[PDB]
Every structure is written in structure tokens, then in C-alpha cells.
């Protein structure tokens, strides 16, 4: 119903489906580097 | 949560996905002069001390 | 009064330092409500009124009392920004979404867009006091001569794409204020059209103008009559040749 | 009739390589632009006094 | 992760393309000038 | 969607070409980066 | 009433998801305070 | 507490959006620079002192 | 005191909403700021010293 | 009568939401000056 | 005195609501402060030394 | 006469309002320059 | 036979990833036992 | 998937297998070589 | 080969019920000759 976009749910659904699919590639990237550098220095 | 996909529905990709670059790219910057800003945890000196070069 | 601490560390410095930070309040208030006489309310893409009218409210109407019997203006008013209006819009929409431009349908220096837009102010001319037309061509005013400077009349008129168009015919004048606002252009194609002398760069042997080319010069809008020209042809005539250094420029050379 | 790459894939590879390097070849004009401009002020910094570099600071 | 080819529905890849040949560039020199600045790792 | 006038094939192609490009860079990045810490290490 | 376009059932809906968000948010946040609270207290 | 979502119709979720974002962003930041302004909550600091660094 | 409804015939909710937002927050900020700045009352500085540390 | 063109009932609806809302503001607020109250007084 | 319902055919009062609520809130704060300023009428000097904190 | 043209029986319901919530202020200052004057009276 | 070819990719590159999710797991358990 | 069109997969597969294979068993023998990272060294010692 | 996609499933499922086994015993001697002598 409501759009200020255009997308229909469907498209909506496409669209953040493929957003969260990078955004948890950027997630895990950024999660493996943290473990990383916890071992060579923690920080807590 | 189910229906977090309506985002969409109220934003643009093009401009949101500019921000995003954006802010990301900025945060990074950010914290790793934050790091290289402390004796410690700069990893340049760090390495240097640790070789002893 | 030194040292004089009305309580604690608080003296007329500090007094008079923070009453001017009040003042400065008022006074920003005051000055950003008197820039809303004109274009508020705010509007969407789709010509409707938006939710947020901006934080500072729109002010009282005052009123302008016109020269030469022209009337009373008020701003803020729906008559001043239903007359200055445009309708008619070339434009599409390049998107739902709000914040992305609109592109323009057709020829964009004819349809009045972008750069080349124009608006509808009044078809009455610019007066004096006197109630004279502002804009006289240099023969009707009387007295005037060229008193310095290249006089242009005569020379060819060099377009943006390096072609010649025609030759100058007459210089129109702002006699209250003696100097020269528009050149007229007798045109091959046997038209006279104006062009505003700051939009034009006399050269010794030639005026060129960068910035539209060969193919606008005949379809710029022209004047009902040929003695004076109004607020509104002006503002069509200027769009249209300001529009040409974004929509001639695949156009302009060197 | 040179310059004709049949394939579709290498034409595109072509390009967008051309692409890449015209932007990293602006910001390298822009680079040396910004080099020579600092260089040339040291340099002709060179030629000042010596009370030009005896200054005291300001602290600041 | 496969439906990331939608950008170039998004973004204009020639202009895409230009930026990150500049972003590249400069990231290159700022980490070399990063380098270049400490003696130990300068190499001139 | 299509904001930019291509379709679902182009797009395919110069993705493939493109990520061609990046791992062709991420394999050269990675191969300097060895040497570096063969030359003056960091870690 | 509406000031911008919503009817009741778009604005209930929207309610909903942003509420879902905001409990997302807060949970996370609660999280990281006790942890925090754990690990050096501040009270 | 039953009808704030009557707020939606009166003010526009772009907007509304834009702004918290922006605002806890600033917010985070600004605690953050705060207690690392703090020694004994910068936990830089800290887990140098922590762990012998 | 029962009336008080029409102070909504009168204001507008858009403004009236977004200026007591502003005004709540910046009140908050500065009641927290005059705190910080006294030392028996830095939840920070107290806790430090509470906890040894 | 409006200076803003609203009718009484909308009125009345919007007068008993922003009290909801203030009321739930004072509520936490009490709270926590309660709390505070008892682990560091100040009168 | 019965008649000072007239003023509000003199003024605006979305105007003299903006006003007053301008007036009261700065007063109070200047107020407050004059307060915080006298060491005896520092109601937080005074609770620290109360309670012996 | 209304300078702002509001008609009498207007101008006396909003000053009803008005008082209202005046004297609600005044009662509420009152209690708490009670209260202050109890714990360190200035006069 | 394109699309055999993209079918069994997926199934390598499937196995072979979670052979790495097993080495990065082994890496760091090794450097916690002892580090370098 | 350009690789699988050019060689058998089994030609891939198979090259890659005992690349890794080697390269797991080198590394191996490297760590065991040194007194330290010598596996059956620090546990004999450190139950002793 | 070819096979099929069922036979292949097939015996993919006989191959790891000898491969568990085979882990199986495994683990349960590792564990055995880390009781006895650990590293
Ligand atoms: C629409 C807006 C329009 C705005 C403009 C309107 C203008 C019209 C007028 C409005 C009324 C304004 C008020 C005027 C009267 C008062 C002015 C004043 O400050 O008098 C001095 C008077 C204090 O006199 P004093 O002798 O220096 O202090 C004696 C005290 O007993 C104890 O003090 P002390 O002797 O201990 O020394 C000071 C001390 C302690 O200082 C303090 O007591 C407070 C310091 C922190 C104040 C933080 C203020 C934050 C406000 C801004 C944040 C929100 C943003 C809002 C603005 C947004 C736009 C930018 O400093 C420290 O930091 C100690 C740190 C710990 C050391 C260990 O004011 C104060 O009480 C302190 C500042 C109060 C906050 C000002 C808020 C602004
Ligand atoms: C103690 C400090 C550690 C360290 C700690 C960490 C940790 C921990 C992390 C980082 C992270 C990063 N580190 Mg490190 N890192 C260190 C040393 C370095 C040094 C250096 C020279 O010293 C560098 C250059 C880097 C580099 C990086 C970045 C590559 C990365 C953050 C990515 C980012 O900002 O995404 C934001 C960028 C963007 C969103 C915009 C990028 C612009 C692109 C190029 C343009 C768009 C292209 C277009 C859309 C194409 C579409 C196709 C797409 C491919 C789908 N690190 C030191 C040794 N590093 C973080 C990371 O990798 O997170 C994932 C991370 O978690
Ligand atoms: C000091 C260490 C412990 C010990 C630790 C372990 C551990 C731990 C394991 C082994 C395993 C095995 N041990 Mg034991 N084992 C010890 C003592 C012995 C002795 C001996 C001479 O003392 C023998 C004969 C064996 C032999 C064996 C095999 C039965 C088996 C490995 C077979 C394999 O890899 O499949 C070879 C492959 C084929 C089947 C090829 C067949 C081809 C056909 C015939 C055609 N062990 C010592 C005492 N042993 C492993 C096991 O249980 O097997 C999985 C195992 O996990
Ligand atoms: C250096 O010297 C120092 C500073 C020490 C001392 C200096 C002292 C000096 C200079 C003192 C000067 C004092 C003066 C000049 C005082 C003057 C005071 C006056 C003129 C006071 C008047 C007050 C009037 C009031 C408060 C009236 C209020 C009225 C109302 C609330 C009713 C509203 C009115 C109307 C008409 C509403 C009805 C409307 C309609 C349309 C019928
Ligand atoms: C100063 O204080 C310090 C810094 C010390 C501490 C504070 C730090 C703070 C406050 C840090 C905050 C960090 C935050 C808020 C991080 C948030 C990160 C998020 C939200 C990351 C999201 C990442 C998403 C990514 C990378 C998504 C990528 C997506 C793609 C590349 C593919 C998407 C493809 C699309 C859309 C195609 C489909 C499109 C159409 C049109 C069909
Ligand atoms: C001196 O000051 C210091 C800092 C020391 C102390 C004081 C600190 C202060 C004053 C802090 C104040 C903090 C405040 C006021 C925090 C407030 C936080 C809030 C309200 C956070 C809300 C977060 C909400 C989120 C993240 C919501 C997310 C929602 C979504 C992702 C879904 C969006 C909506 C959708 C998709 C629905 C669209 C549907 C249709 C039909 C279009
Ligand atoms: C030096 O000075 C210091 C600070 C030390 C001492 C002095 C302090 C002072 C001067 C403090 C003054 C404080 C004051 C005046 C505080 C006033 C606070 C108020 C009035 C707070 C009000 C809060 C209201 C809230 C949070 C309302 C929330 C409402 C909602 C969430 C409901 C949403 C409404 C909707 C949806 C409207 C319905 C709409 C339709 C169309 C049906
Ligand atoms: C040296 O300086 C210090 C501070 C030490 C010494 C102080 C000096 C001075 C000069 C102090 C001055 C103090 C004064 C003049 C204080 C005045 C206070 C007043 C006049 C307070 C008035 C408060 C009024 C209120 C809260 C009214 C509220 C009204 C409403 C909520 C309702 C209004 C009507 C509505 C919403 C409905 C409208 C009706 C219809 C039918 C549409
Ligand atoms: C304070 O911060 C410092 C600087 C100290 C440290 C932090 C640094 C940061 C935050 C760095 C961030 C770097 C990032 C995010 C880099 C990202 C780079 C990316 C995504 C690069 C992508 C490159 C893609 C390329 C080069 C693709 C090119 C494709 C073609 C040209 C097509 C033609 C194909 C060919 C030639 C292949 C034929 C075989
Ligand atoms: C390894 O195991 C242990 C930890 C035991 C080893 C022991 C000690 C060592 C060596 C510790 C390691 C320290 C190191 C090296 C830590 C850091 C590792 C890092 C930072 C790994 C991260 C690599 C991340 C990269 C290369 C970043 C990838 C992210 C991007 C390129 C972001 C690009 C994002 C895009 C293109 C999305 C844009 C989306 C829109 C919508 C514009
Ligand atoms: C020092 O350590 C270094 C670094 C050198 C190396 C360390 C660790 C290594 C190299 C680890 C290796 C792990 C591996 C290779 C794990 C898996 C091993 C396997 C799969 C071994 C070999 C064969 C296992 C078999 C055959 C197990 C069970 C199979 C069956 C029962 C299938 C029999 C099939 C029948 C009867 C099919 C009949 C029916 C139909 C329809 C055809
Ligand atoms: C200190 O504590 C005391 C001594 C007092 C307590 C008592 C006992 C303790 C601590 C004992 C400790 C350790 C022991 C007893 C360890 C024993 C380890 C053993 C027996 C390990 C391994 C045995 C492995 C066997 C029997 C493996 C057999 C494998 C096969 C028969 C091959 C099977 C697979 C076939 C034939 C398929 C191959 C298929 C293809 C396609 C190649």
C-alpha cells in the first residue's frame, strides 16, 4: 500500500534481502578482524 | 523485524546507499586514527619496537 | 563598578553579554521570518502543501504601496504566488521519490525551464518617477549620446558556434540610470530580437555571445512593440539566453 | 576494421579498464598539481634570508 | 551474495568506474605517504 | 527497478567483468603485502 | 486528521515496525550496559 | 500510550528518520569521547595497563 | 484546567511538538553537565573512586 | 473557534494523547529521581 | 478587572504564549542560577555536607 | 474595538483558560516557595 | 554445459569453505594455546 | 565456472587436492622440527 | 559416469555411514591414548 519509493513488497523484499546478505559479509569480515585482533592485543 | 523490508518502501537506494558508503568509510578513518593516535595499539610502532627496527 | 559582582562572578559585562544573546535571538528570529514574504508555503513535487513549513513561522502581511497608481501589494499573499506562478510545466519526473530532479519533456529554452526559466511577472513595463518608461531605445531618449566605450552599433554578432546571425541595429537604455541594458539584433532572417548587453562582450570588431548558438537566435521571444519592452519579456528574453551555456552547449566552440 | 574486438567480454574489460585508469590519472594530475605548488614555495622559501627560519614562534 | 549485480541497476558504472579509479589512487598515496613519513618504514 | 537503464544481463556481464578486475587486484594487494612483511613486518 | 497523507491502519502498521526496531535497539543496548556493569561499574 | 502511532500522522517518517539517526549517532560518539576522555573507562587504557602494555 | 484541549486550537502540533523535543533535551544535557561538573555528583568520578579504582 | 482550523474532538483526541505521553515521561522521570534519591541524596 | 479579557483583542495569543513561555523559562533559569551561585542556597553543596559525602 | 478580531465571547473563554492555568502555576509555586522557605528561609 | 558447471561450483567452493571455517577455527585455537 | 569448461574437473580437483595436501604436511613437519610448535615436545614436558 | 542422481545419493549415504564409523572409532581411540598419555 504505502510507498513513497514505488517498490511494491516484493521488490522491497528482493532489495533487503540482497542489503542483508552484504550487510552480513561486511559483519562477518569485520567480526573474523576483531577476533584477529583481540589474539595480537586485547582490549578488555 | 518480519516487515523491516518497508525501509524501502520509505527511502531510496541511491541516496541511502551514498550515506552509507559515506559513514562507513568516515567511521573507519575515524577509528583508526584513533588507534594510531595511542603510543599502543599502533600497530606501525608496535612492530617496529617488537623487530627492534 | 569594578569588581562589583551583583552575585557571583555576574557584572555588567556579564549582564550586558548575555541580554545581547537575547537581543541576537529576537533578532534572528525577526530576520529569518522576514525572509518567508517569498516562496512560503512549502510545497512538494506534486504542487501540494508539505507538513513541514519549516520551524520559524510565516509572518504578518505588510503591504507596498505601488508608484504611478499600480496598486497595493501584500506579502505574504496568495495572489503574489499564484501570479508569479508558472503552470504548464515541461517537467517529468525523474523518480517517486522526493529530493531527485525533473527532467524537461521538449526544448527546454522554449519551454521555459531550468536556466531557462522565466516568471510571470507583470506585462507593464519599469517606470521612473515620472511615470516615463524605464527601457527607451537610445533614439526615443531624447538627449542621449554614447559618451565613451565602443560604440557596438553596426558590428556583427557572433554566436556560440562561431557563425554570424546579424548585425546591431539599437541600444535600449536605462535613462534614469544612464547605462545600457539590452542590444538589439537585426537578424538575417529579417527579425529584430533583444539580448542583454551583460549576456553580450563587445569586442573591437565584433559582439560575441557565448552563450547560445546559431539555431536559438531566431526563436527568442520577441516584444509587442518596439518602443518598450515589459517586466516579462524581459524575464523570457534573459531565461532563454542564460538557458543556452547548459542547453547549447554541445553547440558552443573554442 | 583494426580495432575491432569481436568479443564482447574484452570490449567490455577494455573500456571500463580505460575508465578506471582517466580517474586515477586525474587524481594524479591533481596530485602533482598540489606537489609542485608546495614544492615550488619551499624552494623559493631557499632563496629567503636566514632570518626567515631564525623566526620565534608564537607558541601557537 | 549472487544478486549483487543489481548495483549497476542503481549506479551508472562509467561514473562508477572514474571514482573508484580516483578513490583507489588516492588511498594508494595516502597509505604511501603514511608510509614514506616513518624512518622505519621509508624506503628512500 | 532499473534505475539506471540496464537489465538483469548486462548487469550480470559487467559484474562478471568487474569482479574479474577486483580479484585480479586482491591478488596482486595480497602478493605485495607478503613481501612487505618479508621486507619490514608489522605484526 | 493527518498532517501528512497516513490514514490509521498505515500509521498502526508503522507503529509496529518502528517499535520492533526501537525494542531491537534498546535490547542491544541493554546488553552492552550490563556487560559494561560486568566489567567496570560505573554506580 | 494507545495511539502514538497518531504521531505518523503529523509528522513525515523521512524526516523523523533522518533526524534519530543522525541524533543517536552523535549521541554514541559523544559518550564515547566522553568516557575516553576518562582514564579509568578508556578501555584503550585500560587493557593496556590490564595487560602489561 | 479541563479545557486545556484547545491549547491545540491555537498551536499547531508540528512546531509546538518539535520545539518541547529540543527544549527536553537540552534541558537534560544541562542538568547532566552541571552535575559532571561538581565532583559529588560525577557518577563517573564517584564510581572510580567507590570501586578502588 | 481555531486559530489552526481544528475541531474540538480532534482536539480532545490529541490533548489525551500528549498527556499519555507526558504522563509516561513523569512516571520514568519519578523513577529515576527516586532511585537517585536513594543512592545519593541532595537535600 | 473583570474586563481583562480585552487583551486578547489586543494581541495574538499564539504570540503572547510564546512570549510568556520564553519569559518564564529564562527567568527561572536565571533564577536557579543566582541560587547555585550563593554557597548557602547551593542545594547541592549543602546535601554533600548533610550527608557527609 | 478587536484589534485582532476576536469577539467577546472568544477572548472571555480563552482567558478562563488562561487564568486556569495561571493560578494552577501560581499554586504550584506557592507549594514549593512553602517548601524552601521551611528548609533555609531568606527572610 | 554451463549450467552443470555453475551447479558443481557451488558444492566445491560449499566444501572447500567449510574447510576454511575448520582451518580459521584451528588457527585461532593454536595462537590461544601459544602465539607468534 | 570457466575453469570446469577448460579442464576435466577431475584435472582441477585432483591437482589442487594434493597441492594442499603437501602444503599442510610441510608445515606440519615445520612446526615439529622446532623444539617450540613440536606438538609431542610441550605436552610431555608440561605432564612431566 | 553419471550414474544417478538417486544412486548417487545412494551410495554417498553408504560411504558416510562408513565414514562416521571410521570417525567414530577414531575419536574413541584418541580419547583412550589421551587418558593415557596426553599432549
Ligand atoms: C532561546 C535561548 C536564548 C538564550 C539567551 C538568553 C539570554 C537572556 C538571559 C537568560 C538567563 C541566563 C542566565 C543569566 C544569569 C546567570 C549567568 C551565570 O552563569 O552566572 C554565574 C553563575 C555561577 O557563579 P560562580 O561564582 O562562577 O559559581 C559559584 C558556584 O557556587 C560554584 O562555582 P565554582 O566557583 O566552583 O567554579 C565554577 C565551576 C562549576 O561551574 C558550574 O557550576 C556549572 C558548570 C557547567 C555548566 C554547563 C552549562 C551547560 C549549558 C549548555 C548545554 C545545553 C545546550 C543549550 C544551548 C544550545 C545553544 C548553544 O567550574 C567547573 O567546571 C568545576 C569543575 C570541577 C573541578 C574539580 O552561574 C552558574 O551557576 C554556573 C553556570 C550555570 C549554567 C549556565 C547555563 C547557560
Ligand atoms: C589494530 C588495527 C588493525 C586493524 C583493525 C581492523 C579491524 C578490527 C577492522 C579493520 C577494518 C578494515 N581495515 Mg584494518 N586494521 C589495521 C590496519 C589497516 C590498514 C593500514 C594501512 O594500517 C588499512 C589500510 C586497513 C584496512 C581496513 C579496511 C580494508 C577495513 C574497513 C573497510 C571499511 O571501511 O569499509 C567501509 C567502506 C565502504 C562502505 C565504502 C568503500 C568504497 C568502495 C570502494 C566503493 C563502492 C564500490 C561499488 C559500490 C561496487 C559495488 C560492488 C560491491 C563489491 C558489492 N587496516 C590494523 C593492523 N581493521 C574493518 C573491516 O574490514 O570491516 C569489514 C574491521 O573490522
Ligand atoms: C601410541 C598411539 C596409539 C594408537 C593411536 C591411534 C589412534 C588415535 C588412532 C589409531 C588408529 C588406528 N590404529 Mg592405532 N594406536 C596405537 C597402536 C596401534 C598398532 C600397533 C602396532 O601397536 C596398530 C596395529 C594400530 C593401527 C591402527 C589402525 C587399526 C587404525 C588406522 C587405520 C587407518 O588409518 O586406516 C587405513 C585405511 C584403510 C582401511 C585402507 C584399507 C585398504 C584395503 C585393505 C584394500 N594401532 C598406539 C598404541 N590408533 C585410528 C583408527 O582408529 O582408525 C580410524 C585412530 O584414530
Ligand atoms: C538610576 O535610577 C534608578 C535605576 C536607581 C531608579 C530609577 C527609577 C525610575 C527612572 C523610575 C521610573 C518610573 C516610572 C516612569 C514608572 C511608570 C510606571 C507606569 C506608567 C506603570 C503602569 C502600569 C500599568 C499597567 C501594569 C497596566 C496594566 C493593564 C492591564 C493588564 C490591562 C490590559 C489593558 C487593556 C486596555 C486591555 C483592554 C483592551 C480592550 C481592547 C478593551
Ligand atoms: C568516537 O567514538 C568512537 C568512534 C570511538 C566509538 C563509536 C563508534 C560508533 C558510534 C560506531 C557506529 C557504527 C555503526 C552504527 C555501524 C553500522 C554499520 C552498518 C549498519 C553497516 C551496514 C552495512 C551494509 C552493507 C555493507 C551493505 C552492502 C550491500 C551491498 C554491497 C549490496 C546491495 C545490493 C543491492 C541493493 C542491489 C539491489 C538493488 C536494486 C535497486 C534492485
Ligand atoms: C550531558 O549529556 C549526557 C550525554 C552526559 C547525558 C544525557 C544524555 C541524553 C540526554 C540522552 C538522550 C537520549 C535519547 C533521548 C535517546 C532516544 C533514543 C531513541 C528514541 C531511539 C530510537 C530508535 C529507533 C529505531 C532504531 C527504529 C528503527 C526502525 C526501523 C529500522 C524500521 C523503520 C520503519 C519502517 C520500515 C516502517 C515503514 C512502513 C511503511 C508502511 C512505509
Ligand atoms: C539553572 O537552571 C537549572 C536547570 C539548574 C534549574 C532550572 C530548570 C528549569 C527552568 C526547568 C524547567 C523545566 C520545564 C519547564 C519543563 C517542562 C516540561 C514539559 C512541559 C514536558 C513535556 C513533555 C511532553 C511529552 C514527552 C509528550 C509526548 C507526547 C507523545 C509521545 C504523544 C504523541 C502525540 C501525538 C501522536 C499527537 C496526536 C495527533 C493526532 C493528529 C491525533
Ligand atoms: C534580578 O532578577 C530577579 C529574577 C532576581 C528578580 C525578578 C524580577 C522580575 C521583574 C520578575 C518578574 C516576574 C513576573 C513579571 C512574572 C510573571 C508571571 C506570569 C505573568 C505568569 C503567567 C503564567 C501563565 C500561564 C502558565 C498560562 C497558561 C495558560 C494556558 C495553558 C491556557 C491558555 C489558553 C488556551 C490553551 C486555550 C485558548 C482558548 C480558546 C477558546 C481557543
Ligand atoms: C586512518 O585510516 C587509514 C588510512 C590509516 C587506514 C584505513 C584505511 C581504509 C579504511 C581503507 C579502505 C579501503 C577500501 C574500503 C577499499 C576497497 C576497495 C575496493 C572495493 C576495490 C575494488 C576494486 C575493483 C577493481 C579494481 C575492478 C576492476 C575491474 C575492471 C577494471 C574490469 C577489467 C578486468 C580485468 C582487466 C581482468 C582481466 C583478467
Ligand atoms: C588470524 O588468526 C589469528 C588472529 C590467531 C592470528 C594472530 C595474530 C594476527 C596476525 C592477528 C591479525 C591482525 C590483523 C591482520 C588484523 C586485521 C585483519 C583485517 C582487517 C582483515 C580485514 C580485511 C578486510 C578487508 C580487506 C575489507 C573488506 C571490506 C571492504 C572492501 C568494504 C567495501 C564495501 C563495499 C564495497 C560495500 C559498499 C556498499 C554500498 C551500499 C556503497
Ligand atoms: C600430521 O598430519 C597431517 C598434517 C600430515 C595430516 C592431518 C590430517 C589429515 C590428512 C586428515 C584427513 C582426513 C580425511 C581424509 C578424512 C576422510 C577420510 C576418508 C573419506 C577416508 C577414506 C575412505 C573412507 C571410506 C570408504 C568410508 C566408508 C565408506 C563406505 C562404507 C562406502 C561403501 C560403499 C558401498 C558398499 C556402496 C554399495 C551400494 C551402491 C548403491 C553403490
Ligand atoms: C593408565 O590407565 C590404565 C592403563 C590403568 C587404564 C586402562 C586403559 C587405558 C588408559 C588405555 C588407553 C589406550 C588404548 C587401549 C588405546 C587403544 C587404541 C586402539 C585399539 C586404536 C585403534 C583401533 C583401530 C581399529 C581396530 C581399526 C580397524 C579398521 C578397519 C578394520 C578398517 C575398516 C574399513 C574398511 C575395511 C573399509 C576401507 C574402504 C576403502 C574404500 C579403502
Given at each position: 500500500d504505502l510507498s513513497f519509493t514505488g517498490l511494491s513488497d516484493e521488490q522491497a523484499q528482493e532489495l533487503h534481502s540482497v542489503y542483508m546478505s552484504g550487510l552480513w559479509l561486511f559483519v562477518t569480515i569485520a567480526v573474523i578482524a576483531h577476533i584477529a585482533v583481540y589474539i595480537w592485543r586485547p582490549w578488555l | 523485524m518480519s516487515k523491516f523490508y518497508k525501509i524501502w518502501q520509505v527511502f531510496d537506494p541511491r541516496r541511502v546507499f551514498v550515506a552509507q558508503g559515506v559513514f562507513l568509510f568516515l567511521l573507519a578513518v575515524m577509528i583508526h586514527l584513533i588507534l594510531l593516535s595511542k603510543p599502543d595499539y599502533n600497530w606501525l610502532d608496535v612492530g617496529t619496537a617488537k623487530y627492534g627496527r | 563598578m569594578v569588581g562589583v559582582n551583583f552575585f557571583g562572578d555576574f557584572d555588567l559585562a556579564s549582564l550586558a553579554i548575555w541580554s545581547f544573546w537575547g537581543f541576537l535571538a529576537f533578532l534572528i528570529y525577526y530576520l529569518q521570518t522576514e525572509n518567508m514574504?517569498?516562496?512560503?508555503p512549502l510545497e512538494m513535487e506534486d504542487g501540494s502543501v508539505a507538513?513541514?513549513?519549516?520551524?520559524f513561522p510565516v509572518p504578518k502581511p505588510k503591504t507596498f504601496k505601488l508608484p504611478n497608481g499600480r496598486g497595493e501589494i501584500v506579502m505574504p499573499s496568495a495572489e503574489n504566488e499564484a501570479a508569479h506562478r508558472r503552470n504548464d510545466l515541461a517537467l517529468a519526473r525523474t523518480s517517486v521519490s522526493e529530493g531527485f530532479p525533473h527532467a524537461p519533456t521538449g526544448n527546454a529554452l522554449v519551454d521555459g525551464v531550468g536556466p531557462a526559466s522565466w516568471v510571470p511577472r507583470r506585462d507593464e513595463p519599469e517606470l521612473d518617477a515620472h511615470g516615463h518608461?524605464?527601457?527607451?531605445?537610445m533614439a526615443l531618449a531624447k538627449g542621449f549620446n554614447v559618451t565613451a566605450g565602443r560604440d557596438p552599433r553596426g558590428l556583427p554578432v557572433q554566436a556560440a558556434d562561431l557563425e554570424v546571425v546579424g548585425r546591431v541595429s539599437e541600444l535600449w537604455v536605462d535613462v534614469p540610470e544612464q547605462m545600457v541594458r539590452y542590444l538589439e539584433i537585426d537578424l538575417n532572417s529579417g527579425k529584430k530580437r533583444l539580448v542583454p548587453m551583460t549576456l553580450a562582450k563587445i569586442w573591437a570588431d565584433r559582439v560575441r555571445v557565448n552563450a547560445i548558438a546559431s539555431d536559438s537566435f531566431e526563436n527568442i521571444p520577441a516584444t509587442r512593440s518596439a518602443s518598450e519592452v515589459t517586466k516579462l519579456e524581459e524575464d523570457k528574453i534573459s531565461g532563454y539566453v542564460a538557458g543556452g551555456w547548459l542547453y547549447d552547449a554541445d553547440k558552443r566552440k573554442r | 576494421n583494426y580495432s575491432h574486438e569481436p568479443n564482447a567480454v574484452i570490449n567490455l574489460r577494455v573500456w571500463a579498464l580505460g575508465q578506471m585508469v582517466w580517474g586515477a590519472f586525474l587524481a594524479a594530475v591533481g596530485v602533482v598539481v598540489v606537489i609542485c605548488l608546495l614544492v615550488g614555495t619551499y624552494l623559493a622559501g631557499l632563496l629567503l634570508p636566514e632570518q626567515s627560519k631564525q623566526a620565534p614562534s608564537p607558541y601557537g
Amino acid at each position: 500500500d504505502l510507498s513513497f519509493t514505488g517498490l511494491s513488497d516484493e521488490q522491497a523484499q528482493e532489495l533487503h534481502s540482497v542489503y542483508m546478505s552484504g550487510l552480513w559479509l561486511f559483519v562477518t569480515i569485520a567480526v573474523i578482524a576483531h577476533i584477529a585482533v583481540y589474539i595480537w592485543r586485547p582490549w578488555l | 523485524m518480519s516487515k523491516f523490508y518497508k525501509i524501502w518502501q520509505v527511502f531510496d537506494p541511491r541516496r541511502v546507499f551514498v550515506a552509507q558508503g559515506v559513514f562507513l568509510f568516515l567511521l573507519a578513518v575515524m577509528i583508526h586514527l584513533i588507534l594510531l593516535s595511542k603510543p599502543d595499539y599502533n600497530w606501525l610502532d608496535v612492530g617496529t619496537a617488537k623487530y627492534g627496527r | 563598578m569594578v569588581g562589583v559582582n551583583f552575585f557571583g562572578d555576574f557584572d555588567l559585562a556579564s549582564l550586558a553579554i548575555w541580554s545581547f544573546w537575547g537581543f541576537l535571538a529576537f533578532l534572528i528570529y525577526y530576520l529569518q521570518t522576514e525572509n518567508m514574504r517569498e516562496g512560503y508555503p512549502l510545497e512538494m513535487e506534486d504542487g501540494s502543501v508539505a507538513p513541514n513549513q519549516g520551524l520559524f513561522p510565516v509572518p504578518k502581511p505588510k503591504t507596498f504601496k505601488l508608484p504611478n497608481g499600480r496598486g497595493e501589494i501584500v506579502m505574504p499573499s496568495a495572489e503574489n504566488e499564484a501570479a508569479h506562478r508558472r503552470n504548464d510545466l515541461a517537467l517529468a519526473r525523474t523518480s517517486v521519490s522526493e529530493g531527485f530532479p525533473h527532467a524537461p519533456t521538449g526544448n527546454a529554452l522554449v519551454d521555459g525551464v531550468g536556466p531557462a526559466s522565466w516568471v510571470p511577472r507583470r506585462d507593464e513595463p519599469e517606470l521612473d518617477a515620472h511615470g516615463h518608461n524605464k527601457i527607451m531605445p537610445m533614439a526615443l531618449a531624447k538627449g542621449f549620446n554614447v559618451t565613451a566605450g565602443r560604440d557596438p552599433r553596426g558590428l556583427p554578432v557572433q554566436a556560440a558556434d562561431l557563425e554570424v546571425v546579424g548585425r546591431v541595429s539599437e541600444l535600449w537604455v536605462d535613462v534614469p540610470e544612464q547605462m545600457v541594458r539590452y542590444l538589439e539584433i537585426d537578424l538575417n532572417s529579417g527579425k529584430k530580437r533583444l539580448v542583454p548587453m551583460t549576456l553580450a562582450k563587445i569586442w573591437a570588431d565584433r559582439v560575441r555571445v557565448n552563450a547560445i548558438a546559431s539555431d536559438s537566435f531566431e526563436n527568442i521571444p520577441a516584444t509587442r512593440s518596439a518602443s518598450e519592452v515589459t517586466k516579462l519579456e524581459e524575464d523570457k528574453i534573459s531565461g532563454y539566453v542564460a538557458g543556452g551555456w547548459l542547453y547549447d552547449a554541445d553547440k558552443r566552440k573554442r | 576494421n583494426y580495432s575491432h574486438e569481436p568479443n564482447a567480454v574484452i570490449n567490455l574489460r577494455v573500456w571500463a579498464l580505460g575508465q578506471m585508469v582517466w580517474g586515477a590519472f586525474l587524481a594524479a594530475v591533481g596530485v602533482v598539481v598540489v606537489i609542485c605548488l608546495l614544492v615550488g614555495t619551499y624552494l623559493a622559501g631557499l632563496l629567503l634570508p636566514e632570518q626567515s627560519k631564525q623566526a620565534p614562534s608564537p607558541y601557537g
